[PDB]
Amino acid sequence: SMDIGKKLLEAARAGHDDSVEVLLKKGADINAKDNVGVTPLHLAAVNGHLELVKLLLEKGADINATDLFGLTPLHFAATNGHLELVKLLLEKGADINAVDDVGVTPLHFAARNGHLELVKLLLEKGADINAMDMVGPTPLHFAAKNGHLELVKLLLEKDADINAEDHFGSTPLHSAAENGHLELVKLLLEKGADINARDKFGKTPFDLAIDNGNEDIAEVLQKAARSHHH
Amino acid sequence: DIGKKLLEAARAGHDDSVEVLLKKGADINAKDNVGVTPLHLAAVNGHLELVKLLLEKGADINATDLFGLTPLHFAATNGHLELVKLLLEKGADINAVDDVGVTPLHFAARNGHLELVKLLLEKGADINAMDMVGPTPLHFAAKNGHLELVKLLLEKDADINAEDHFGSTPLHSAAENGHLELVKLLLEKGADINARDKFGKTPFDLAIDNGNEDIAEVLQKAARSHHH
């Protein structure tokens, strides 16, 4: 009659801190888990409730706990861009280079969602800017696929390989072309991106732009390829 | 020479320069290497009065460049609403298609311009363009994380399960690009989580392949919720 764990989980999932503390006082398991192995700390991390995280951490919750797919609280906090929560977690034991079951690091997630400042912070505290799972998508790949311009500038300025390959031979210029990000394509061309690169199936960025219905981008790629009078 | 100077003048908004060059006898329908006209450039840059001028001075409103794009396409791409109204009111075709079947609505959706999409739909645009053979407006909005715009399109009966040429559905696109809240939304509205693309991959598979473990978790919870 007393499944207190799922109640605590639901309170953490919905930001209701007072209920979480009441249940904790009554003696709810601070390390309770849902079906995918997610703990209240994981949820406090995604929702960005800092003080709740402090409380859980001091009351004994495990900071390097991994859910079923190998995600840590740091991963989730990084996904939602909560800077001070990231700082706190780092300052009390979390591994900055933690890896999930497919080789993805927190920096990857910060890059994917366009959190520029958090990326700067992670890089200054030792994150690997060219972290591929072994060979997989790089942070720059993630930034390029989702159109995050300033972040691309930052990563390139911190010497990310502008021509790195993922598992399918794709470059960042491929990703940007496939998603129809015009200003980003211009930026990558301006910084020396390889316009003739072919993926594992022989496709150029131009080919992908056509395949995905982005004909303005395709235009730009064609002028880029042919612009030399003599 | 006069053609390129007229082109650069249109591309840079200098209207007085445009009329001087026209009087000097520049072809009002001149074309660069990708077939783009001064009207095209005025359209992409959102120079309304210039567009009115060129239109009064004889410019062709339905001219197509090298890939079949019209002035309306560029205006829709860059979100210039009032310019779109003006073009529509003097002859422009609302459902024009370029060489791969993409319409102005596709581009307005891809770039997240909510009001302009609302307007295009009010003026007769086809919400299900290339349904079930190629990318639809919903594909484009979903691939780039535009939540509100996806809500709008679904409310006006966009096909939530349409497949593009590679068998991909919108839920595929959202999963592979890691748009979490959009995946949740698509799940709530009946997207098929067991849909398989041309390579047999489900949205869950794509999420794994693209290093998106949070999206995969949500898909796992849905999958085990309705084991039906």
* Mutation for testing the B interface, residue in A215, A223, A227 having most B CBs under 10 Å: A215
Q: For the domain made up of B1-228, give the CATH fold.
A: 1.25.40
C-alpha A27/C-alpha A32 separation (Å) is 12
Contacts of A24 (CB under 8 A, 6+ apart): A8, A30, A55, A59
Q: How buried is A165 (Cβ within 10 angstroms: 0-12 exposed, 13-18 middle, 19+ buried)? A: buried
Tell me the nearest-neighbour CA distance from A218 into chain B, angstroms.
Answer: 9
Q: Which of B135, B132, B142 is nearest to B189 (CA)?
A: B142
Q: Are A205 and A197 in contact (CB under 8 A)?
A: yes
C-alpha A114/C-alpha A16 separation (Å) is 28
Bin A120: left if φ > 0, else alpha if -120 < ψ < 50, else beta. Answer: alpha
Q: How buried is A91 (Cβ within 10 angstroms: 0-12 exposed, 13-18 middle, 19+ buried)? A: exposed
C-alpha A119/C-alpha B8 separation (Å) is 39
**H or E element that contains B89:** helix B81-89
For A176, phi then psi, to 5°, come to -60, -40
Please give the DSSP secondary-structure letter assigned to residue B228: -
Bin B139: left if φ > 0, else alpha if -120 < ψ < 50, else beta. Answer: alpha
Bin A48: left if φ > 0, else alpha if -120 < ψ < 50, else beta. Answer: left
Taking the alpha carbons of A126, A131, A133, A137 in that order, is the dihedral positive or negative?
positive
Contacts of B33 in chain A (CB under 8 A): 223, 226
Q: Determine the longest span between alpha carbons in chain B, in angstroms.
A: 74
Residue A64 sits at the vertex; the CA angle it makes with A58 and A65, to the nearest 5 degrees, is 95
Q: Which of B124, B39, B29, B48 is nearest to B73 (CA)?
A: B39
Q: Which of B32, B82, B12, B30 is nearest to B52 (CA)?
A: B82
Residue that is written with structure tokens 């349904």 in the block: B131
C-alpha B94/C-alpha B75 separation (Å) is 12
Tell me the nearest-neighbour CA distance from B113 into chain A, angstroms.
Answer: 15
Query: For A21, what's the count of Cα atoms within 13 Å in the CB-facing half-sphere?
Result: 10
Strand ranges (DSSP E) for chain A?
none
Contacts of A146 in chain B (CB under 8 A): 144-145, 177-178
C-alpha A173/C-alpha A180 separation (Å) is 10
Residues comprising chain B, all counted: 228
Q: Are A141 and A108 in contact (CB under 8 A)?
A: no
Tell me the nearest-neighbour CA distance from A106 into chain B, angstroms.
Answer: 11
Contacts of A147 in chain B (CB under 8 A): 144
Contacts of A80 (CB under 8 A, 6+ apart): A45, A46, A47, A48, A113
Contacts of A68 in chain B (CB under 8 A): 217
- Please report, in angstroms and rounded to a whole number, the separation of the first and last CA atoms in chain B: 70
Taking the alpha carbons of A118, B171, A166, B218 in that order, is the dihedral positive or negative?
positive
Query: For B110, what's the count of Cα atoms within 13 Å in the CB-facing half-sphere?
Result: 26
Q: Check A102 against B208: CB less than 8 A apart.
A: yes
Residue A115 neighbours by CB distance under 10 Å:
23
Contacts of B208 (CB under 8 A, 6+ apart): A102, B216
Method: X-ray
- What would you report as the CA-atom Rg of chain A, rounded to the nearest whole angstrom? 21
C-alpha A151/C-alpha A15 separation (Å) is 30
* Mutation for testing the A interface, residue in B103, B144, B217 having most A CBs under 10 Å: B217
Q: Which CATH architecture has domain A1-230?
A: Alpha Horseshoe (1.25)
C-alpha A79/C-alpha A189 separation (Å) is 29
Resolution of the deposited coordinates, in angstroms?
2.5
Chain breaks in chain B (C to N over 2.5 A) after: none
Q: Check B220 against A145: CB less than 8 A apart.
A: no
Tokens of A64: 């390097």
Q: Check A219 against B106: CB less than 8 A apart.
A: no
C-alpha B177/C-alpha B193 separation (Å) is 16
* Mutation for testing the B interface, residue in A36, A72, A76, A148 having most B CBs under 10 Å: A36
Q: Are A151 and A181 in contact (CB under 8 A)?
A: no
